[PDB]
Amino acid sequence: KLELRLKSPVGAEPAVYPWPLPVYDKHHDAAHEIIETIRWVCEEIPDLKLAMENYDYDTKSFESMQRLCDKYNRAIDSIHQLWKGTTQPMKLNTRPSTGLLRHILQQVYNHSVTDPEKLNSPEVYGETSFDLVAQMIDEIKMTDDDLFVDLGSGVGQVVLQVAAATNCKHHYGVEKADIPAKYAETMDREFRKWMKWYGKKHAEYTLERGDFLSEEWRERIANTSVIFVNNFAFGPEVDHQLKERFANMKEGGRIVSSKPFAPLNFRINSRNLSDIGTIMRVVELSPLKGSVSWTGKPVSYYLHTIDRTILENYFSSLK
Ligand SMILES: CC(C)N(CCCNC(=O)Nc1ccc(C(C)(C)C)cc1)C[C@H]1O[C@@H](n2ccc3c(N)ncnc32)[C@H](O)[C@@H]1O
């Protein structure tokens, strides 16, 4: 029946929406996905922006929606034309800006998480931690050297965010529970599709089914240089096993978490000598003012860097 279609700015399969356009949740529907996508594409292509200094808008009239899609598609055609002339294509494979990325990931999520219901009351998945993760990404400089892992990666959004944002040799997510691992497969597909659609590049990444305490993971963890773990509700048993597995990490390796694995007020003495606190610097990271603020209360986060010289110094300090 009735449809709206958006042409990709790089000639990928157009995006096709049914009318009336679905609503996703109380604060998201396809209408606004459509508008937001159009706006984002104008940011990729200043030229497209120039073509469309015309658009507030009526999202419940199909006619009003279709003029918008039409103007956009037509300007797209116009742009593709320009690129046959001496004007060169928009720089091919760049990373998406943050703004675009937040959009894309919203899009991927909504197209992948059909029924946001099979996900338990409490924020045990982190639904709007995008800005938070974005902050982390800003602070923890990463490079083609690093390997990244999100321990208990959920449906994968954080892995996708980092992979989109950084140039690690590889990013990994590992998830035990079956239903989110299922969703992650679609997330993965949706993500690849939308990134092609906007013609934006991403670092290599993999989503996996697995337990991060499983024998196999001991080795991998020791090999990972950047670990993100949202351990807020892990408690005693699991924190310990993790500390265990961290102790084998190379010098420089980083762990970013919600609960600290050492303490910050930690100075090295006779009976704390096998405490992990001896092989790692720990800092409290500044929270975001607009923090999701778990437990109706402002909460911050922790960067641990594997630094053995801390130990070495305590053996130099015995002459
Ligand atoms: C709460 C966390 C741990 N996780 C979902 C979050 C998606 N990714 C995420 O939030 N990353 C992240 C976000 C923010 C931060 C900061 C705090 C900002 C630094 C750090 C990391 C839960 C998933 O972990 C899975 N989990 C728990 C243990 C378990 C297991 N041992 N092996 C496999 N997966 C397992 C569990 O099944 C859930 O699907």
UniProtKB/Swiss-Prot annotation:
Record domain DOT1: where: 13-319
Chain positions found as Phosphoserine: S286
Impact noted for substituting C42G: Found in a patient with developmental delay and intellectual disability; uncertain significance
Effect of N230 to A/D: Loss of activity
Residues binding S-adenosyl-L-methionine: 125-128, 148-157, 175, 211-212
Cellular location(s): Nucleus
Segments traversing the membrane: none
Top-rank lineage group of the source organism: Eukaryota
Function statement: Histone methyltransferase. Methylates 'Lys-79' of histone H3. Nucleosomes are preferred as substrate compared to free histones. Binds to DNA.
UniProt disease annotation: Defects in DOTL1 are associated with an autosomal dominant form of global developmental delay and intellectual disability, with or without one or more major congenital anomalies. The patient phenotypes are characterized by central nervous system (CNS) dysfunction, such as mild motor delay and significant speech and language delay, and a range of congenital anomalies, including brain structural anomalies, cardiac defects, varied urogenital features and growth restriction. Variants may cause a gain-of-function effect leading to an increase in cellular H3K79 methylation levels.
Further details from the record: In contrast to other lysine histone methyltransferases, it does not contain a SET domain, suggesting the existence of another mechanism for methylation of lysine residues of histones.
Family according to the record: Belongs to the class I-like SAM-binding methyltransferase superfamily. DOT1 family.
Protein name: Histone-lysine N-methyltransferase, H3 lysine-79 specific
Organism: Homo sapiens (Human)
Higher taxonomy: Eukaryota, Metazoa, Chordata, Craniata, Vertebrata
Entire protein: shown range: 4 to 330 of 1537
